[PDB]
């Protein structure tokens, strides 16, 4: 796999970003997570960590897995990098999104995910307080 430039367009949620990406705006829905809805607990709190994190960034970029590259209502799938750092990690990593939604063909970076879901639970961070 390899990254991909993107900019960022806009913030929209926990696990859902706008972003150019070969000259054309796209939800990009992050693969691998869920991040509660912002109504629900932690849900503002993910939006703001993730608005930040990619507004912050010098350089986005974008990582498709190896299977669908977009889901069902046209949203892109990939792995969201922020200065070389995966967002995905970064939200799991603070109990901020669940380990979630892992098909067959499209999971790559599972197990990294699943290592740092396990420090937040053990840190009882976040979701797991
Ligand atoms: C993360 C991801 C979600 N989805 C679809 C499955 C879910 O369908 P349903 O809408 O039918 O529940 C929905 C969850 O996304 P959200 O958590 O953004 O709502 O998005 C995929 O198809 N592939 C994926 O890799
Ligand atoms: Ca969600």
Do not use: C
């Not at 367009?9 to 991040?35: E, N, S, W």
């Not at 608005?51 to 949203?75: H, L, P, S, W």
């Not at 999971?107 to 840190?123: C, G, P, S, V």
Request: hydrophobic share 35%.
């Amino acid at each position: 796999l390899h990254k991909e430039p993107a900019t960022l367009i806009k913030a929209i949620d926990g696990d859902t970003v706008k972003l150019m990406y070969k000259g054309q705006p796209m939800t990009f829905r992050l693969l691998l997570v869920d991040t509660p809805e912002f109504n629900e607990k932690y849900g503002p709190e993910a939006s703001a960590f993730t608005k930040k994190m990619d507004e912050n960034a010098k350089k986005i970029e974008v990582e498709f897995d190896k299977g669908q590259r977009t889901d069902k209502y046209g949203r892109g799938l990939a792995y969201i990098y922020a200065d070389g750092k995966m967002v995905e990690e970064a939200l799991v990593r603070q109990g901020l999104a669940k380990v979630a939604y892992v098909y067959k063909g499209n999971n790559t970076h599972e197990q990294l995910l699943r290592k740092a879901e396990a420090q937040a639970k053990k840190e009882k961070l976040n979701i797991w307080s």
